[PDB]
Every structure is written in C-alpha cells, then in structure tokens.
Write a protein that binds this DNA or RNA. Structure first.
Length: 66
DNA sequence: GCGATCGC
DNA sequence: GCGATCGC
C-alpha cells in the first residue's frame, strides 16, 4: 500500500495504488484514473518521478491488448 | 500541440 | 465527440 503523489491543478494530492483503476502513458506522463472513497478522478506524474509500484502497474497494462 | 484516455 | 488532465 504505497501512495502516489501527484499535482492536480496546482494542488498536492495523493492516492494509494490500490485505488487506481487504469494506468497508461501519454507521452512522458504516467497517467491514471482512480476512485478514492467515492471520489473518482485522474492524476499523472512524470515517468522519472513515478514510484516503482506505479511503473510496474503500467508495464502490466502495456502487456495487454487495446 | 500532442500523446492516451474518460467524463459528461 | 469535445474538453479536460499532466509532462514535455
């Protein structure tokens, strides 16, 4: 249970990896949707600032069909 | 502006 | 099927 830290509209936010729904790479933005206690949203961080657990989630998603 | 993607 | 997010 690691927390992903990201900036959204200037604010500092955090979401546990277990709340992440979908992860993808848009350019160098590791992007993701999540549902945090009813709050559905989207976040993104640079690949260079993403925690290993998020990158591993990303690799698992890149392995599957589109 | 572009990338990938979903809310609405 | 745009508008919207971030990183670049």
């Amino acid at each position: 249970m690691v927390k992903v830290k990201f900036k959204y509209k200037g604010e500092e936010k955090e979401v546990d990896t277990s709340k992440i729904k979908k992860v993808w790479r848009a350019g160098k933005a590791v992007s993701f949707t999540y549902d945090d206690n009813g709050k559905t949203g989207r976040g993104a961080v640079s690949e260079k600032d993403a925690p290993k657990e998020l990158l591993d989630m990303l690799a698992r998603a890149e392995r599957e069909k589109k």
